[PDB]
Amino acid sequence: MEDFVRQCFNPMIVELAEKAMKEYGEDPKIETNKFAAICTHLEVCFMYSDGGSKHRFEIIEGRDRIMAWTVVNSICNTTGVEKPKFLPDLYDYKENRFIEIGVTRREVHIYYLEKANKIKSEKTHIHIFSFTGEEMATKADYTLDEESRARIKTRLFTIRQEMASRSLWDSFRQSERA
Numbered sequence: 001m002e003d004f005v006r007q008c009f010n011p012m013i014v015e016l017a018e019k020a021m022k023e024y025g026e027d028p029k030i031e032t033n034k035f036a037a038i039c040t041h042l043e044v045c046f047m048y049s050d051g052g053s054k055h056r057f058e059i060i061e062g063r064d065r066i067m068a069w070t071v072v073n074s075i076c077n078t079t080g081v082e083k084p085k086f087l088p089d090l091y092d093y094k095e096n097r098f099i100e101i102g103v104t105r106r107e108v109h110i111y112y113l114e115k116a117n118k119i120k121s122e123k124t125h126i127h128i129f130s131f132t133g134e135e136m137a138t139k140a141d142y143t144l145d146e147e148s149r150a151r152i153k154t155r156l157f158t159i160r161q162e163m164a165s166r167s168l169w170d171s172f173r174q175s176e177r178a
């Protein structure tokens with residue numbers, strides 16, 4: 001799985017993922033499924049932000065904490081949008097809302113609920129993707145056009161298929177906890 005990650009995700013993604021794990025005292029070489037999940041989520045966040053019109057989205061995920069909150073507090077001051085308790089993943093300038101993105105190895109509905117329970121904030125939009133084509137978003141509002149989403153869903157299927165071809169999928173699939 002370590003070899004799979006370093007081979008299928010670009011170096012910037014892999015570097016951010018390693019940083020996040022070490023910030024929690026975890027070793028990417030040991031908790032390899034977590035390593036793959038973090039890379040995957042980062043990749044989805046970056047694809048999502050490219051999926052709109054130019055400049056539609058601000059990326060919050062992937063930034064160090066100081067810069068992330070700088071962006072968030074700057075957006076809140078400028079738009080008067082409510083300040084979230086937790087860093088979200090993106091801001092949508094067109095819809096004037098933050099977005100929390102989830103990628104789940106389980107089922108989209110359960111993950112969506114966990115995310116909602118956690119945010120509790122009324123304003124932040126939630127969008128969940130799975131590795132088997134399914135998605136779920138707040139009030140069935142999927143934000144991007146279906147072509148953009150299809151490309152995200154297809155990339156995730158492609159990752160699943162790759163892990164499976166290497167016998168990594170069984171372990172990976174069963175590694176997400178409530």
Ligand SMILES: O=c1ccn([C@@H]2O[C@H](COP(=O)(O)O)[C@@H](O)[C@H]2O)c(=O)[nH]1
Nearest residue numbers: 024037038041042061088089101102103
């Ligand atoms: O404190 C944290 C926050 C997030 N994550 C992981 O980073 C990825 C993205 O988190 P989120 O933006 O969906 O909350 C997920 O795999 C999640 O479990 C952590 O390990 N620790």
Ligand SMILES: [Mn+2]
Nearest residue numbers: 061087088089
């Ligand atoms: Mn995040």
Ligand SMILES: [Mn+2]
Nearest residue numbers: 089100101102
């Ligand atoms: Mn997220």
